[PDB]
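Hi,

I'm pasting everything inline rather than attaching a file, because the server keeps stripping attachments. The sequence lines come first, and each chain or strand is labelled.
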Amino acid sequence: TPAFDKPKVELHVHLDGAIKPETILYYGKRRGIALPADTPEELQNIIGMDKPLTLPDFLAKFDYYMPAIAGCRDAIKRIAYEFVEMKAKDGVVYVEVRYSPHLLANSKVEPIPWNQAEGDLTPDEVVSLVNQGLQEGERDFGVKVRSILCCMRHQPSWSSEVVELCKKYREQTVVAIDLAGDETIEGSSLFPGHVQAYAEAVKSGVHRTVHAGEVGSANVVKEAVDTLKTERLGHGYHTLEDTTLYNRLRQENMHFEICPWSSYLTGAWKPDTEHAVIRFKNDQVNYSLNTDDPLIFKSTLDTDYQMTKKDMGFTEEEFKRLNINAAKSSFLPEDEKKELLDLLYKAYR
Ligand SMILES: Cn1c(CCC(=O)Nc2ccc3ccn(CC[C@H](CO)n4cnc(C(N)=O)c4)c3c2)nc2ccccc21
Ligand SMILES: [Zn+2]
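And the predicted assembly:
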């Protein structure tokens, strides 16, 4: 069955939304936290969506389940270990996984997230434990894995710590900074704390992506490219509403991190219309296909491949092309990136 039975690369999935029902049930059982249920069965149904909803309804599900992992070392490392596992099972041979370290912390972070009480699990420590689990997981399951730390739109006060974290754990497994959250917050791309993190990212050679043009305007994409200097875009769909920016980004070979099934469920893409990625396939744009939050969207990577193959007539050699384009726009050392590409061009023959 699976739409594209071949090796894959994925650049855009978030750890905190790539968590198995059963491990959430586990941890908060053992924690006293509790949940809108206690089978890892009915759990999936309530956290998963089948339908667009508002942002509030979206965020409150991080509020049921986050409190179960966040704070608990064991649970941080574990979720990252078995993240890699999921990807092995998608046939992925390289994945960049992203998250905010503050959002799993319980100590040395204000405000403290998720109505947690203060503990002594700090963000820097978060990174450490994530690292271990992905690294150990790379070892056990045969998928090359790096990670990306997210600043969050609404709290520019955390972004200098993000970049510093990026520089300290640099490719142990951190390779890039990201900007995630509510991208409609008025002027958020230009908050000095964000701007100055991304400038220090240029100064110290840390790679840069930015979620933009998902649910914001094409002015948000422009700000990500021109001011934050990003190298790739998260989603970027609304780029198409500004033609000269579109055309320049095609000429510059900008990579767009597309998340198709994501884009139905979040409202990004409105189903009476054109999918965005269809335009990009016809224009030979540099983009990849990605899942974002499989937990929440009920999905695996094959989901997004089936959607494009079935609803959009994507073909095998288009799936090949974009995975090559994903590996080319990855944030690895150039030596490792060529090694990637060799693996894949071998598999595709
Ligand atoms: C508008 N909209 C967005 C756009 C993205 C958005 O606003 N996200 C957002 C906003 C504020 C917060 C505050 C915390 N988070 C979660 C952070 C974590 C960090 O790794 N995370 C995990 N997944 C996402 C994501 N898909 O946006 C972000 C936020 C995430 N996501 C939606 C999903 C269902 C329905 C509507 C949606
Ligand atoms: Zn995302």
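The chain has one domain: 1-349.

If the labels don't parse on your end, tell me and I'll reformat.
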